[PDB]
Amino acid sequence: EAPAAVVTGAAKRIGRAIAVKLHQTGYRVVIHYHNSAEAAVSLADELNKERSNTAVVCQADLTNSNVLPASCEEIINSCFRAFGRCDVLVNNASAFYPTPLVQKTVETQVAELIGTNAIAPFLLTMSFAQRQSSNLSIVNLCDAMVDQPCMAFSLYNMGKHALVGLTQSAALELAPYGIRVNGVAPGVSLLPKDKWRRKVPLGRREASAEQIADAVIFLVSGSAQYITGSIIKVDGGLSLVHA
Amino acid sequence: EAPAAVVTGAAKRIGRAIAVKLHQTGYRVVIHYHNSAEAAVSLADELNKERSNTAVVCQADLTNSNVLPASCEEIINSCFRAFGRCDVLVNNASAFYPTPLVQGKTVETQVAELIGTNAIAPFLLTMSFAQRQSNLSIVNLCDAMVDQPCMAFSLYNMGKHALVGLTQSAALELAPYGIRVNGVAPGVSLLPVAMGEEEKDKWRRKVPLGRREASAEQIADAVIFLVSGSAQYITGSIIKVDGGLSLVHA
Amino acid sequence: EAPAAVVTGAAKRIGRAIAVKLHQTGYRVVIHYHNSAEAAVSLADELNKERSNTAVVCQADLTNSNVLPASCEEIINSCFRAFGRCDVLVNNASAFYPTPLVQGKTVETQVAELIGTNAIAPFLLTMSFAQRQKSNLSIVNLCDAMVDQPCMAFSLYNMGKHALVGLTQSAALELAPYGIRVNGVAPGVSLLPVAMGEEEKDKWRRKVPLGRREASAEQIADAVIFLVSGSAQYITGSIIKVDGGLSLVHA
Amino acid sequence: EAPAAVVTGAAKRIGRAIAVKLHQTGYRVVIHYHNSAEAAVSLADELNKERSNTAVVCQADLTNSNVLPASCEEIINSCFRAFGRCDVLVNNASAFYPTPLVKTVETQVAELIGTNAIAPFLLTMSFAQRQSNLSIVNLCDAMVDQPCMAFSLYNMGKHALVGLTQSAALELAPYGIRVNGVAPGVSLLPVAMGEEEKDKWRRKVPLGRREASAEQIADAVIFLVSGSAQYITGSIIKVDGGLSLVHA
Ligand SMILES: NC(=O)C1=CN([C@@H]2O[C@H](COP(=O)(O)OP(=O)(O)OC[C@H]3O[C@@H](n4cnc5c(N)ncnc54)[C@H](OP(=O)(O)O)[C@@H]3O)[C@@H](O)[C@H]2O)C=CC1
Ligand SMILES: NC(=O)C1=CN([C@@H]2O[C@H](COP(=O)(O)OP(=O)(O)OC[C@H]3O[C@@H](n4cnc5c(N)ncnc54)[C@H](OP(=O)(O)O)[C@@H]3O)[C@@H](O)[C@H]2O)C=CC1
Ligand SMILES: NC(=O)C1=CN([C@@H]2O[C@H](COP(=O)(O)OP(=O)(O)OC[C@H]3O[C@@H](n4cnc5c(N)ncnc54)[C@H](OP(=O)(O)O)[C@@H]3O)[C@@H](O)[C@H]2O)C=CC1
Ligand SMILES: NC(=O)C1=CN([C@@H]2O[C@H](COP(=O)(O)OP(=O)(O)OC[C@H]3O[C@@H](n4cnc5c(N)ncnc54)[C@H](OP(=O)(O)O)[C@@H]3O)[C@@H](O)[C@H]2O)C=CC1
Ligand SMILES: Nc1nc2ccc(C(=O)NCCc3cccc(Br)c3)cc2s1
Ligand SMILES: Nc1nc2ccc(C(=O)NCCc3cccc(Br)c3)cc2s1
Ligand SMILES: Nc1nc2ccc(C(=O)NCCc3cccc(Br)c3)cc2s1
């Protein structure tokens, strides 16, 4: 029928905006959630009321664990079950908090910050490609501030750098299969705050979630059919600003 | 009225595809050319038949000299003269040829053409664009292969690297005026006219995504996106349109 | 007294070359190893025969697990127990093998080994090195010049080396106030795999612009020596490629 | 036979520290200068006092023009005439001032692009054409991706120099000439800058809250020209105390 997209952490904030905009563009969507069932279903309700049976929810914890692989397989599968196909994977879900070097157990911090930020994308990518004319692509939510990191955010920063590596390695490896792999790297978007707004060259404010979603839409579209291994910054110039 | 765009080197190939698609999107266009008089006039005819009074040509050499600033000022002025505004500048015109370090143009001319067209003219057009100032934006045609350059293309590569610096510096400085500055970086696209065919296929086979070069239209698509209302928070960004080519090791 | 360095995976190859050159420069060294027990003890013996009580060994698996923190803590502790100080940490140990996306070991074991050795262990060692400080302190991470032009089907390895770049920057930033510098050395092609045939070796050699040959272990060690030296006292968050130009060559 | 090095803008500041350290290392040096004749000669006299006939001066404007090629060939020539060889080229000379988008503009172009990029390229061509541990070191800028406001031409020139470093490394590698860069962050601050302004900059540097000494920069240069960097080409070492890692 129409194409189908998986968006991880799609309940709230940036993932919800991505899900909505993909829907508005005529995708059927899987709304993945971990904790936010109420929010996920509510979003699903709003989209199905717009177009019948075009949105489903999918629960999974994306912490790294012996079961992460099974969870990731399940997320992809639920797209194939619901819609008979899977055209787009958006790796949006992400944990974010400090992990000081001069100081949750550390290994929980690893499991969340590397697991959800990098390992789950890699596993989802594997399942997506394993289960594959069409316009197949993956979009990873990266970070424009990766080379100028927040103090005491090493594991977070490590996970986002790993996600860049995944974007590049997967683009190279899946290109022969017609699967494109790209990234979108926000700066300051939806915040945890004017201190940070004032720093942004373009308009002294944060990106809306929808601005982020815009770039995703571009990358999934037929207007990006030659684009793979690209990461588009969406940061209003913040990463250009020196100390 | 409809917004207006300048596209440098717009008579042929990628610049032509960019002028077309901007036009098809509702822009009035200035078609800058240097030598390609016929092709320039032909394209402006084609666009004007489609919507009258939406296309002009403007002739200018973009080689570095003491009069390059006046030429660049003139390109921008031509947009204001024809359309009363200038919303979009596309820095597309480019000289490209080998300049080996170890050895019929002088080196002073090679510098003038490769650094002038690829970098200095962009800078001067940017200044003139900004001084004469909705959804204002500049798009520089960069090069996805700038960190893995062709052998013996040092001056070309230097110019393209300078264009990256321009993209970042002007993005930062023009942001408070609401002008966004971004780039599109092709890998291998429309292959040179004076090139073989076993040799075109050599380059084609290296491209991971589909073992082929980009169409001009595919490059133009990325330009359209960056000027569009969908890229309003995007500045200082360079989008590679290279089908994975820059990711491939030797 | 003499400064002391920990070098991970120092029994053979590049890690041995680094331990040896640090030793010749006047450092006491901890030779970490995992499986190469014979080669590690042989090296310590050699170094001790040159100046006694200047080399120890230290065994640890650097695979990710709930005990990796303790093992990384123990590596650093081994240096303080032998030498009374720890001045330099070289994160050299590395697992390296294909993990094709389109399909030995389970995937969770591949994650544990490639991400564990290449990134998580460096992070935990960095944390232990910093916390146990209580002079010229620095950390050197062995990165990869080819991280942005990766080998086909090495996604997990590439992810781990990219994470190590992030650690290098993040830790340089966070530890600079403590006087600890953090930098990286990024080989291109160096000591080829012991497994690889000569035919394949020469294919890779011919791609190197500077001399059509791989880096010697010594050449890699040379850059590490620079970064720990007083000649690099203002250098932090820098990653020096030692690749003969390989990363500049297009496809 | 002692090796020989050309250092551009060697009269003062960083280029002076580079020439001195190369000399201390055993090199004979051509001290290139533009305006600072007295400082250049005074350096040559000091070095020649240390070791007779090991230092000469060479005056040249590195602004872009129809004669820049000739000038750069003559700089390289002076090293061969003086010392019979040229082992090392250090592209250090640089103009630096703002060029806001909103002197004539073409003079700004000629000065900022000429000294920072064109003259390096022409010197590199002349160096290689006249040709063992041969290498070139370009003085780049650690902050090129986080530029000062209204420094576009300066920034463009320094990005061009990165391109040169990479392109020339690749192309000269077959002749055994290595090409590398050193990218300072904040080093010697202007003499005239008020201490209170210097301190705003110093405060931003993670490693020690101070600017690099000229000697710290020269140390990296010494490494890259040494036998300890024999496999290193196309590399750019930041010497910035972590400055480029600091967000807005
Ligand atoms: N926001 C910004 O300004 C910035 C954004 N980014 C990137 O943008 C993306 C989206 O950002 P934003 O919307 O703010 O993200 P959030 O931090 O709000 O998290 C997004 C969603 O991720 C899910 N998630 C978190 N941890 C886990 C876990 N362990 N297992 C499963 N799901 C989990 C949650 O779903 P649930 O609620 O259902 O539990 C959560 O709502 C991220 O990838 C982020 O790194 C980059 C830089 C800055
Ligand atoms: N084609 C490709 O594969 C790739 C292209 N690019 C970049 O994309 C852009 C467009 O590519 P492409 O269409 O191939 O470009 P072309 O090589 O076809 O050149 C574009 C135009 O630049 C103009 N130009 C050349 N020299 C001068 C000069 N001295 N003064 C004024 N104009 C001049 C010419 O105009 P006229 O004919 O009127 O004289 C020419 O048609 C360029 O910036 C290029 O560097 C990036 C990498 C790959
Ligand atoms: N060789 C090259 O061409 C290149 C090297 N590099 C990097 O340079 C560094 C050194 O390279 P090289 O000497 O070839 O490295 P090797 O592949 O030879 O590995 C070095 C050591 O890592 C240790 N190691 C492996 N897995 C584990 C583990 N699970 N737990 C603990 N230790 C482990 C081994 O110790 P043991 O033998 O005791 O079990 C091994 O001797 C690495 O970080 C590498 O990625 C980068 C690019 C190219
Ligand atoms: N200082 C710092 O903090 C930083 C420095 N750098 C880079 O480090 C290098 C050395 O820095 P620094 O010592 O501060 O440099 P300066 O700004 O002090 O300039 C060095 C020399 O360049 C020469 N020069 C300037 N314009 C010309 C010209 N038209 N023709 C010929 N020579 C010219 C001058 O020679 P004369 O006096 O004889 O006329 C001058 O003494 C430069 O390339 C610079 O960009 C980069 C990052 C920051
Ligand atoms: N004005 C112009 N600029 C450029 C820039 C690049 C090219 C081109 O053909 N680039 C291909 C470079 C390349 C480099 C390595 C592998 C492969 Br296949 C292709 C062609 C042009 S035309
Ligand atoms: N622990 C280890 N890590 C690594 C990492 C890389 C290599 C290696 O041989 N890399 C070379 C890959 C490559 C990529 C492109 C051109 C060429 Br000639 C060679 C070998 C090892 S062993
Ligand atoms: N020829 C010359 N080139 C340059 C280049 C840069 C500088 C300089 O002062 N750079 C520091 C810029 C900077 C930017 C942000 C924070 C901090 Br403290 C310092 C000084 C000079 S002098």
Side-chain angles (χ1 to χ4, degrees), chain A residues 20 23-24 29 31 43 46 57 77 79 87 101 109 126 151 157 162 164 178 194 207 226 243:
Chain A
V20 170
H23 191 256
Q24 295 166 342
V29 301
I31 296 150
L43 169 61
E46 164 185 319
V57 302
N77 280 339
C79 196
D87 301 274
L101 290 171
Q109 293 175 324
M126 265 189 107
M151 177 72 76
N157 195 230
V164 175
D194 268 282
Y226 201 67

Side-chain angles (χ1 to χ4, degrees), chain D residues 52-131:
Chain D
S52 304
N53 291 3
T54 59
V56 297
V57 301
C58 183
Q59 194 288 333
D61 191 355
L62 297 181
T63 308
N64 186 224
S65 76
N66 75 339
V67 307
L68 184 54
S71 305
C72 290
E73 195 173 50
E74 175 52 35
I75 293 169
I76 294 314
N77 276 343
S78 76
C79 192
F80 279 96
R81 289 187 211 112
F83 304 122
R85 56 193 289 166
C86 192
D87 303 84
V88 159
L89 166 66
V90 182
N91 292 300
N92 164 84
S94 172
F96 175 76
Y97 53 82
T99 56
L101 288 168
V102 281
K103 300 183 164 153
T104 74
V105 69
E106 263 293 341
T107 299
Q108 298 182 321
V109 168
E111 286 174 4
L112 292 166
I113 307 298
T115 63
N116 283 299
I118 309 323
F121 159 81
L122 293 173
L123 289 162
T124 299
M125 256 188 102
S126 289
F127 174 91
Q129 284 175 10
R130 309 285 262 76
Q131 302 301 333

Side-chain angles (χ1 to χ4, degrees), chain C residues 1-11 13-48 50-102 104-133 135-193 195-198 201-202 204-251:
Chain C
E1 70 180 1
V6 167
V7 180
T8 66
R13 291 164 59 84
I14 287 163
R16 179 173 159 132
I18 291 162
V20 167
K21 192 165 299 243
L22 282 162
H23 190 258
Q24 292 167 168
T25 309
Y27 283 78
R28 301 173 287 161
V29 297
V30 181
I31 303 149
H32 161 269
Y33 71 100
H34 175 207
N35 289 319
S36 299
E38 187 157 344
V41 169
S42 180
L43 172 59
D45 284 344
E46 282 209 39
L47 298 171
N48 280 320
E50 189 84 23
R51 307 188 304 274
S52 54
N53 307 310
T54 59
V56 290
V57 307
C58 179
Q59 198 278 338
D61 194 351
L62 292 182
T63 298
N64 195 44
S65 73
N66 292 333
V67 311
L68 185 57
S71 314
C72 293
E73 192 176 301
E74 172 52 18
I75 291 170
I76 294 315
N77 280 335
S78 286
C79 194
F80 282 99
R81 273 198 322 264
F83 307 124
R85 60 197 288 182
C86 190
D87 296 86
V88 161
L89 161 68
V90 178
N91 284 307
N92 165 88
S94 168
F96 173 75
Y97 54 79
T99 60
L101 286 172
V102 160
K105 301 179 162 144
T106 53
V107 58
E108 277 291 331
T109 298
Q110 297 170 337
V111 171
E113 294 182 330
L114 292 162
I115 305 302
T117 60
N118 286 290
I120 308 309
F123 160 85
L124 292 170
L125 287 163
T126 289
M127 175 180 283
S128 294
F129 173 94
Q131 291 183 26
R132 288 243 29 205
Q133 304 307 319
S135 87
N136 171 35
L137 308 180
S138 89
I139 305 179
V140 181
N141 293 328
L142 271 290
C143 298
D144 192 320
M146 302 292 294
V147 281
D148 292 320
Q149 292 139 81
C151 294
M152 180 71 61
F154 282 73
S155 53
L156 276 176
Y157 171 78
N158 187 259
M159 291 169 73
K161 284 311 204 199
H162 267 271
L164 186 54
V165 177
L167 177 56
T168 306
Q169 302 178 150
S170 282
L173 180 71
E174 182 170 3
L175 305 186
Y178 302 76
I180 304 162
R181 294 174 305 101
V182 184
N183 295 291
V185 172
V189 305
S190 189
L191 300 181
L192 271 330
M196 184 172 289
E198 191 63 14
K201 298 198 172 157
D202 280 349
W204 310 113
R205 283 163 177 151
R206 266 192 301 263
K207 295 161 195 291
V208 181
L210 194 63
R212 302 304 159 180
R213 63 188 309 157
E214 69 269 49
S216 74
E218 195 170 332
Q219 286 169 333
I220 308 308
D222 277 333
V224 181
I225 291 316
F226 170 68
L227 281 166
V228 307
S229 83
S231 290
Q233 67 190 152
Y234 196 72
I235 302 183
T236 194
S238 300
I239 297 170
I240 297 182
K241 293 176 285 162
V242 184
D243 77 341
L246 174 73
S247 66
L248 306 175
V249 180
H250 64 70

Side-chain angles (χ1 to χ4, degrees), chain B residues 13 94-96 143 145 150 156 187-188 191-192 203 206 245, chain C residues 250-251:
Chain B
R13 300 162 52 78
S94 166
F96 169 88
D143 189 320
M145 298 300 287
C150 296
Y156 170 77
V188 76
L191 290 151
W203 307 128
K206 299 177 165 357
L245 181 65
Chain C
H250 64 70

Side-chain angles (χ1 to χ4, degrees), chain B residues 139-154:
Chain B
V139 184
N140 297 330
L141 275 289
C142 297
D143 189 320
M145 298 300 287
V146 73
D147 293 320
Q148 285 132 283
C150 296
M151 177 69 68
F153 283 76
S154 63

Side-chain angles (χ1 to χ4, degrees), chain B residues 2-11 13-48 50-102 104-133 135-192 194-197 200-211 213-250:
Chain B
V6 165
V7 183
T8 66
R13 300 162 52 78
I14 287 167
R16 183 192 203 272
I18 288 166
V20 168
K21 266 201 205 289
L22 285 169
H23 188 261
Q24 290 174 350
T25 306
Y27 281 88
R28 302 178 279 169
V29 301
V30 172
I31 297 151
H32 157 273
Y33 70 92
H34 173 212
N35 288 330
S36 298
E38 276 197 346
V41 162
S42 178
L43 166 74
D45 282 359
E46 182 187 324
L47 298 183
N48 274 322
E50 197 74 26
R51 297 196 309 266
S52 59
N53 306 325
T54 55
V56 296
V57 303
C58 171
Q59 196 283 326
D61 186 9
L62 292 182
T63 298
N64 192 38
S65 75
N66 286 332
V67 307
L68 184 54
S71 297
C72 291
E73 188 163 50
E74 166 57 13
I75 288 157
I76 298 295
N77 283 335
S78 85
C79 197
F80 279 84
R81 169 182 327 124
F83 308 120
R85 58 195 286 172
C86 190
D87 303 85
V88 159
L89 160 65
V90 181
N91 284 306
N92 164 89
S94 166
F96 169 88
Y97 51 84
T99 61
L101 287 170
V102 189
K105 317 182 137 155
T106 55
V107 63
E108 29 266 276
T109 297
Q110 295 182 324
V111 163
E113 288 173 358
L114 294 166
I115 307 295
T117 65
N118 286 304
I120 303 306
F123 163 81
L124 297 166
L125 288 161
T126 299
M127 277 190 88
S128 283
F129 179 93
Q131 215 88 222
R132 290 291 321 257
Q133 313 298 334
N135 181 32
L136 308 177
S137 87
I138 303 183
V139 184
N140 297 330
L141 275 289
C142 297
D143 189 320
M145 298 300 287
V146 73
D147 293 320
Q148 285 132 283
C150 296
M151 177 69 68
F153 283 76
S154 63
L155 278 175
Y156 170 77
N157 189 64
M158 283 171 78
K160 287 303 198 197
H161 265 273
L163 189 61
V164 174
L166 172 60
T167 309
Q168 298 176 153
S169 283
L172 177 73
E173 187 172 354
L174 300 183
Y177 301 84
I179 305 160
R180 296 175 302 97
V181 182
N182 291 291
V184 167
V188 76
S189 190
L190 299 200
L191 290 151
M195 201 203 272
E197 215 257 63
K200 282 185 174 166
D201 287 334
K202 207 195 71 145
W203 307 128
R204 285 181 178 119
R205 278 191 274 283
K206 299 177 165 357
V207 182
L209 188 67
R211 310 288 157 186
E213 75 274 34
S215 80
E217 298 75 15
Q218 288 176 321
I219 301 318
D221 279 334
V223 183
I224 299 317
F225 167 76
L226 285 160
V227 304
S228 86
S230 296
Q232 262 183 157
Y233 201 68
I234 298 185
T235 198
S237 294
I238 296 169
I239 299 169
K240 293 184 267 162
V241 187
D242 76 348
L245 181 65
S246 63
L247 299 181
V248 184
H249 66 65

Side-chain angles (χ1 to χ4, degrees), chain C residues 213 215 233-234 237-238 241 244, chain D residues 210 212 216 228 231 234-235 238 241:
Chain C
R213 63 188 309 157
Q233 67 190 152
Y234 196 72
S238 300
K241 293 176 285 162
Chain D
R210 62 198 114 195
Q216 281 166 337
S228 291
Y231 201 69
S235 294
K238 290 179 291 172

